[PDB]
Amino acid sequence: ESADLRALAKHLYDSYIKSFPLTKAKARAILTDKSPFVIYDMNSLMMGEDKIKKEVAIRIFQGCQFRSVEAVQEITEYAKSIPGFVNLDLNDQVTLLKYGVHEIIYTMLASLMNKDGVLISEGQGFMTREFLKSLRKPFGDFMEPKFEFAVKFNALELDDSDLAIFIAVIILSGDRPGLLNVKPIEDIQDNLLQALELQLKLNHPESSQLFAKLLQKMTDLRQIVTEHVQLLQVIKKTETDMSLHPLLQEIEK
Numbered sequence: 473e474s475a476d477l478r479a480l481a482k483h484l485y486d487s488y489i490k491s492f493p494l495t496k497a498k499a500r501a502i503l504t505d506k507s508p509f510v511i512y513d514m515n516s517l518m519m520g521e522d523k524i525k526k527e528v529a530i531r532i533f534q535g536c537q538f539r540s541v542e543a544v545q546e547i548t549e550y551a552k553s554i555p556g557f558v559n560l561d562l563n564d565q566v567t568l569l570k571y572g573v574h575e576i577i578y579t580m581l582a583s584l585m586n587k588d589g590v591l592i593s594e595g596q597g598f599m600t601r602e603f604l605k606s607l608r609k610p611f612g613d614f615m616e617p618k619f620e621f622a623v624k625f626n627a628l629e630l631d632d633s634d635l636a637i638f639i640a641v642i643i644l645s646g647d648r649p650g651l652l653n654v655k656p657i658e659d660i661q662d663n664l665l666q667a668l669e670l671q672l673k674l675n676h677p678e679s680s681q682l683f684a685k686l687l688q689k690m691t692d693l694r695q696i697v698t699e700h701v702q703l704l705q706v707i708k709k710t711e712t713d714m715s716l717h718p719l720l721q722e723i724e725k
């Protein structure tokens with residue numbers, strides 16, 4: 473019944489707010505109290521360290537990786553609040569988070585992008601898209617496909633309460649490799665999909681087939697993840713100098 477789907481939508485929105493400090497509404501408010509420092513080239517980067525809290529590219533990369541680690545923690549905390557998730561087989565829990573985390577990272581990253589750049593450091597900074605594109609060797613191409621996805625994804629005009637259900641749906645795929653019991657993951661996702669359908673039709677009544685258009689975006693996500701994993705393998709052989717966080721590259725298998 474509809475009353476149960478709304479209750480689940482409201483639960484997930486509430487946990488999303490608690491697990492993710494920098495929401496989309498806050499990011500949209502900043503992008504449009506206190507403006508960010510805009511990093512757009514070699515010198516402002518170093519003024520921004522003065523203002524806001526080793527080659528320049530790999531420096532940016534090392535911080536892009538530490539942010540992802542931070543994001544893994546928040547997604548983990550958010551996953552536990554999804555009704556039925558902690559009751560799954562512990563190995564499936566790990567498997568769902570292993571394969572689910574990058575798709576959510578890049579989904580949430582779009583909340584922080586416009587066509588020009590991306591908010592960094594809890595919104596205190598803003599790094600321009602073309603400065604990022606101007607990095608050397610293989611780094612200039614780490615962020616460009618995310619920008620391309622964000623532009624199309626952000627055109628859907630989702631708000632946080634929408635994204636809470638969508639992130640939850642991503643986590644409970646069951647499509648994932650290595651899963652021991654797919655059926656209880658699917659009953660959960662099934663109910664999440666029911667919740668997302670009512671949510672989008674109630675929130676975006678004039679937005680035709682938004683539900684379906686949203687699920688088709690789950691294809692662009694798998695692709696940028698694929699693209700990114702390969703970009704890391706290049707980094708590893710180019711940069712034997714440069715390490716990687718064990719939370720990330722153990723997920724990165």
Ligand SMILES: Cc1oc(-c2ccccc2)nc1CCC(=O)c1ccc(/C=C2\SC(=O)NC2=O)cc1
Nearest residue numbers: 517520521531532535536539540543577580581592
């Ligand atoms: C991969 C990822 O995921 C997310 C995210 C966001 C919200 C929710 C979930 C995930 N955001 C990013 C990218 C962040 C951005 O790329 C970035 C971050 C730190 C530095 C560190 C600096 S700042 C300076 O002046 N010098 C530096 O080296 C640079 C760039």
